[PDB]
RNA sequence: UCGAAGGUGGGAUCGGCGAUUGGGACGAAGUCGUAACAAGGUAGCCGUACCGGAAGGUGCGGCUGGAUC
RNA sequence: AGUAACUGACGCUGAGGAGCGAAAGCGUGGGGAGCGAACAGGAUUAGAUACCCUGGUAGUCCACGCCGUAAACGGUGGGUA
RNA sequence: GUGAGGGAUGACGGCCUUCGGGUUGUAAACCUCUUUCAGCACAGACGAAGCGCAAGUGACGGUAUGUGCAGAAGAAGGACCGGCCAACUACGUGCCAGCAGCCGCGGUAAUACGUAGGGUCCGAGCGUUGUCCGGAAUUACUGGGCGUAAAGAGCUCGUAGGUGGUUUGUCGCGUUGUUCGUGAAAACUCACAGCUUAACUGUGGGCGUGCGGGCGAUACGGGCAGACUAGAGUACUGCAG
RNA sequence: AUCAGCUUGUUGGUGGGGUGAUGGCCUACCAAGGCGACGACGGGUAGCCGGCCUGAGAGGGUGACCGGCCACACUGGGAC
């Protein structure tokens, strides 16, 4: 089960000595809803071929989201492409607050609570690149502590330890219910 | 002011049943009008408004009313979606419907407005009454003698009584205990879309 | 001219991290020394030791690298600088990297880390954000 | 810009280009129309629109566009004018409301009736 | 003694109008023209002085955001 | 650049202010081969008040003052690590 | 508040049709129900441990509020439907008559004009208009740039100001170190409670983000009270232009 | 600053009067300066504040009602 979405459809054109040659380009985002993200950019002369190319490229290119239970770990300032997209977690149930392309990519990621803002070049392609880079910039507390050579309690806050323990207990309960 | 027009219009146009017993919806799922079969471009705003209008035309609430529930639910420290679901389910109409004493939300609302119900021995005729924790709902003899109430109370074989609601006897006494969680509430639709649409 | 030793130190360290270097030699000072001390205590750096040069004391800092070569330091930036000096009260201690980073705050005891500073309830000027 | 520059000078906020300055920020004025005639649009649009010159209480001479397909305005007539921009006409920034003072709603209107001032059919 | 109002006389600011004139923008379409964009048929541009209905031309100095060899 | 004898916080940038500054232009008084705005002719064009040709007045030179602008470009202020 | 439960492979009539039919539609006529609030009557407050040594004192109001009577009986409209932006077809004139917040729409067959239906949004309110913030990171302290898009002044010397190369010493005037001490009332936020719930207000907290003095600290961030030199300058010898 | 100097009881001292209270609040006599590029004097606008709207915040806009002050009562003055 994968989540599919389309963000923008553009009628690109090419010129020859005879006249105008039209073409179609599409960008799609694929995700499993658990924290696995794939982006695809596909070009054709017709929408079905375009979306097929986009889906294939997205299937080729994947990326994993290290989310804590339901939300993001820490605020991230994703500076890439030409747009500035700033992501940070929030209180559970607040919702994934983001623009169009960011909305699509985060919903395909499966996150449920995020605060986002795009600060320039509202173009969908650049926004998607900036969000992907923002997720790449994300760091996870366990291997952050491993890199720093200091144990978890001496690195990460007790509140996020409590949240992680609650998330682990909920995941264990869900696994038990699914097995039974 | 309440929508006096046909109720099947909402389900037919919108694409999911609301009352649940609509034969017209299952006969023709497409929206009415000369051109309900025309292809429609996908839109996040279409679907966000779609969830909103499903919710509001399903529970029968007012627009200002529902926005006030939204801001209320936001300002309680608890999770916004669960708070909104409680503050909407706490409407006495929905409570008395899901308790099995009414055949539909509209009929619960009409009977409450006419005032066939007693709350803790106090006269109440307000469809939008608020029910807090550990409250008592009573039904008066003038309404036990009412014929449609008898039909409802000896035909109550509808969806099962929830955890927080329960009836104790033939007098149709409705009691509330605690705050339900979303998982056992298992209400259709998704509050995330509504909260995000009002987050716009 | 040479006008900010702490910013110069932070920039040389993060430039060395970007250039994948291992050893950096800087002029020695008390501020540099105890900042290296708190860096060693938190564990973002490997180790430091002082030396003697042609004129005065100098301090060398060895960067930290793991088996898979990814940087042990993500980025540095200074918030309090000559001119714009920013300070924090006892309740408005800055949150860095969602609490996963470290802010260096000079309190009545000295240059101490933000978490234990909030534990003590003490506060002051934030030197830099290290994450 | 550096810290001492900001301290020394300070930053001046933008000034808003006010639109329909003849209203002086006041939504509606009453006016008397002096002349009624027609004007031609720009290159993209070719038509023959109707505009009126109205003396405002603010003693400001401004053009006023007449919506609808029919009107009975003549010289020395009582007119109520609101603010509204038109693209094709170069120097017209106001629209004449319908159904007030000497102007009556244009007949045969049944759709979008409140905007043009039509009473309800029985 | 002070003292408001009033009147003498000349300076500043805000203005309103004013023959006529100078300049600008929007119309659309017409005459006069070939200016610039390709070595645009005299390489372009900048500062400056002169000249000519007009775009411009020339002198001096500076740049290549100039193509060949 | 080397020796590093000595001073021992004198360093940096710098609003307003002040000094220098391509060519052309102006005053006074000299100089003035070549070059060359302006202006005459000759030539082309339907048309040339331009491009081309023959001439040549300011200027181009000198001294004292002035104006203080250039695509004054590395179209990038300086200093430090 | 202007209703309903059930009611047909879905009765008129309108609009399209490919002339098969589809639309308005569970809508409607229908069989039953309670009839809120207005309508007609009865009772009828508290607001007053109040004032008087008097015999009474309520404008509101004979209202609010209860108790009975009759009847679904008295009750819905406004914008939008080219893309932005949830909502389309037909009919009538074609660079005319006209729309419009940005792009922009009619030069005989318009989902953008006008009329019809149909659907969407909202609702006792519906839109237009004007002012203010947000998106506008579009005045960028957090949080912008200066090669070509807007920008490095022509370049130096340098006054006032802003900022300083090590470690050798007090007072604590930049400062945090804790406590008592103000923060009127009202408002905001948290919980409680009352008017049948509704606005409304009834009580007690809490909130009240700044500033006053007495007591306890010295790591950075300044003056002040003494020494050294990694910046800088000088000194000795040469150097090319 | 497309407003660079302002001021002559003006500035300061002493002695008198003055007022509930000190004081160029008023007078006389002595000296020449004070305020000024860390924006004076000039020009336009406007009651201030607890608050309201918007914005996550910073900030921006604003002064409805209520409430804390301020100033006025057709215009200008004066006093019991
Ligand atoms: Mg950046
Ligand atoms: Mg942008
Ligand atoms: Mg944008
Ligand atoms: Mg919002
Ligand atoms: Mg810079
Ligand atoms: Mg402007
Ligand atoms: Mg309309
Ligand atoms: Mg229309
Ligand atoms: Mg004038
Ligand atoms: Mg005039
Ligand atoms: Mg021509
Ligand atoms: Mg040419
Ligand atoms: Mg030519
Ligand atoms: Mg040329
Ligand atoms: Mg040229
Ligand atoms: Mg020139
Ligand atoms: Mg010439
Ligand atoms: Mg030259
Ligand atoms: Mg070029
Ligand atoms: Mg020595
Ligand atoms: Mg120097
Ligand atoms: Mg300097
Ligand atoms: Mg200086
Ligand atoms: Mg200056
Ligand atoms: Mg300067
Ligand atoms: Mg000079
Ligand atoms: Mg000079
Ligand atoms: Mg020369
Ligand atoms: Mg010269
Ligand atoms: Mg001359
Ligand atoms: Mg001369
Ligand atoms: Mg001479
Ligand atoms: Mg010559
Ligand atoms: Mg010549
Ligand atoms: Mg001659
Ligand atoms: Mg000639
Ligand atoms: Mg210049
Ligand atoms: Mg040069
Ligand atoms: Mg320079
Ligand atoms: Mg530099
Ligand atoms: Mg029925
Ligand atoms: Mg009643
Ligand atoms: Mg009484
Ligand atoms: Mg009594
Ligand atoms: Mg009552
Ligand atoms: Mg539409
Ligand atoms: Mg739509
Ligand atoms: Mg047509
Ligand atoms: Mg409709
Ligand atoms: Mg706004
Ligand atoms: Mg900064
Ligand atoms: Mg900016
Ligand atoms: Mg530029
Ligand atoms: Mg420049
Ligand atoms: Mg310049
Ligand atoms: Mg100094
Ligand atoms: Mg102290
Ligand atoms: Mg204290
Ligand atoms: Mg206090
Ligand atoms: Mg109080
Ligand atoms: Mg709030
Ligand atoms: Mg109560
Ligand atoms: Mg309170
Ligand atoms: Mg605040
Ligand atoms: Mg200092
Ligand atoms: Mg010594
Ligand atoms: Mg030296
Ligand atoms: Mg030499
Ligand atoms: Mg005296
Ligand atoms: Mg005395
Ligand atoms: Mg005095
Ligand atoms: Mg005296
Ligand atoms: Mg305030
Ligand atoms: Mg904000
Ligand atoms: Mg802001
Ligand atoms: Mg204010
Ligand atoms: Mg008051
Ligand atoms: Mg006071
Ligand atoms: Mg008066
Ligand atoms: Mg007065």
UniProtKB/Swiss-Prot annotation, chain A:
Domain S5 DRBM: 2-65
Any single GO BP term: translation
Keywords linked to the UniProt accession: Ribonucleoprotein, Ribosomal protein, RNA-binding, rRNA-binding
Cystine pairs: none
Keyword Transmembrane set for record: no
GO molecular function, one term: rRNA binding
Manganese among keywords: no
Domain of life the protein comes from: Bacteria
Cellular component annotations (GO), alphabetically ordered: small ribosomal subunit
Family from the record: Belongs to the universal ribosomal protein uS5 family.
Domain observations: The N-terminal domain interacts with the head of the 30S subunit; the C-terminal domain interacts with the body and contacts protein S4. The interaction surface between S4 and S5 is involved in control of translational fidelity.
Its biological purpose: With S4 and S12 plays an important role in translational accuracy.
The protein's assembly and partners: Part of the 30S ribosomal subunit. Contacts proteins S4 and S8.
Protein name: Small ribosomal subunit protein uS5
Organism: Mycolicibacterium smegmatis (strain ATCC 700084 / mc(2)155) (Mycobacterium smegmatis)
Lineage of the species this protein comes from: Bacteria, Bacillati, Actinomycetota, Actinomycetes, Mycobacteriales
Curated annotation (Swiss-Prot), chain B:
Stored Pfam families: Ribosomal_S4, S4
Example GO BP: translation
Domain of life, source organism: Bacteria
UniProt key word Membrane: no
GO cellular-component term (any): small ribosomal subunit
Residue ranges, annotated region (Disordered): 1-41
Domain (S4 RNA-binding) ranges: 90-156
Alphabetized UniProt keyword annotations: Ribonucleoprotein, Ribosomal protein, RNA-binding, rRNA-binding
Single Gene Ontology MF annotation: structural constituent of ribosome
Similarity field: Belongs to the universal ribosomal protein uS4 family.
Subunit structure comment from the entry: Part of the 30S ribosomal subunit. Contacts protein S5. The interaction surface between S4 and S5 is involved in control of translational fidelity.
Name of the featured protein: Small ribosomal subunit protein uS4
Originating organism: Mycolicibacterium smegmatis (strain ATCC 700084 / mc(2)155)
Swiss-Prot record, chain C:
Domain of life: Bacteria
Keywords annotated in UniProt: Ribonucleoprotein, Ribosomal protein, RNA-binding, rRNA-binding
GO molecular function terms noted in the UniProt entry: rRNA binding; structural constituent of ribosome
Annotated GO biological process: translation
Gene3D superfamilies for the chain: 3.30.1370.30, 3.30.1490.10
Pfam family, any one: Ribosomal_S8
TM regions (residue ranges): none
GO cellular component: ribonucleoprotein complex; ribosome
Family of this protein: Belongs to the universal ribosomal protein uS8 family.
Protein's job: One of the primary rRNA binding proteins, it binds directly to 16S rRNA central domain where it helps coordinate assembly of the platform of the 30S subunit.
Assembly, per entry: Part of the 30S ribosomal subunit. Contacts proteins S5 and S12.
Name of the featured protein: Small ribosomal subunit protein uS8
Organism for this UniProt entry: Mycolicibacterium smegmatis (strain ATCC 700084 / mc(2)155) (Mycobacterium smegmatis)
Gene: rpsH
From Swiss-Prot, chain D:
Cited InterPro entries: NA-bd_OB-fold (IPR012340), Ribosomal_uS12 (IPR006032), Ribosomal_uS12_bac (IPR005679)
Protein name in UniProt: Small ribosomal subunit protein uS12
Subunit structure: Part of the 30S ribosomal subunit. Contacts proteins S8 and S17. May interact with IF1 in the 30S initiation complex.
Segments of skewed composition (Basic residues): 107-117
3-methylthioaspartic acid carried by residues: 88
Family: Belongs to the universal ribosomal protein uS12 family.
Molecular function GO labels: rRNA binding; structural constituent of ribosome; tRNA binding
Gene Ontology CC: small ribosomal subunit
Organism field: Mycolicibacterium smegmatis (strain ATCC 700084 / mc(2)155)
Job of this protein: With S4 and S5 plays an important role in translational accuracy. Interacts with and stabilizes bases of the 16S rRNA that are involved in tRNA selection in the A site and with the mRNA backbone. Located at the interface of the 30S and 50S subunits, it traverses the body of the 30S subunit contacting proteins on the other side and probably holding the rRNA structure together. The combined cluster of proteins S8, S12 and S17 appears to hold together the shoulder and platform of the 30S subunit.
